[PDB]
Design a protein around this ligand. Sequence first.
Ligand SMILES: [Ca+2]
Ligand SMILES: [Ca+2]
Ligand code: NA
Length: 95
Amino acid sequence: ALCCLWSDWINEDHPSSGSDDGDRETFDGVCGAPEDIECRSVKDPHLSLEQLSQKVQCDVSVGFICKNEDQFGNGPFGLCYDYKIRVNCCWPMDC
Ligand SMILES: [Ca+2]
Ligand SMILES: [Ca+2]
Ligand code: NA
């Protein structure tokens, strides 16, 4: 069968850190090919993305991407929340 486990939280980028003007989280070095991914805001971790307001990308191919300019605001106001991810990874095991 397949034995699947959820990783610890990954939170290596932040909306006002680095040079990417956003928040990107990857599972490189954690799992080779996640079966699932969970992307959550740090300040409201119980809300799924379908319960959040921001424009983000969250999938098992690229991981998590939020770009600050995609968020609601006028002028320079408005940016990504800080997000964190878990990945669900499965191993072929007889668990
Ligand atoms: Ca950043
Ligand atoms: Ca982050
Ligand atoms: Na975005």
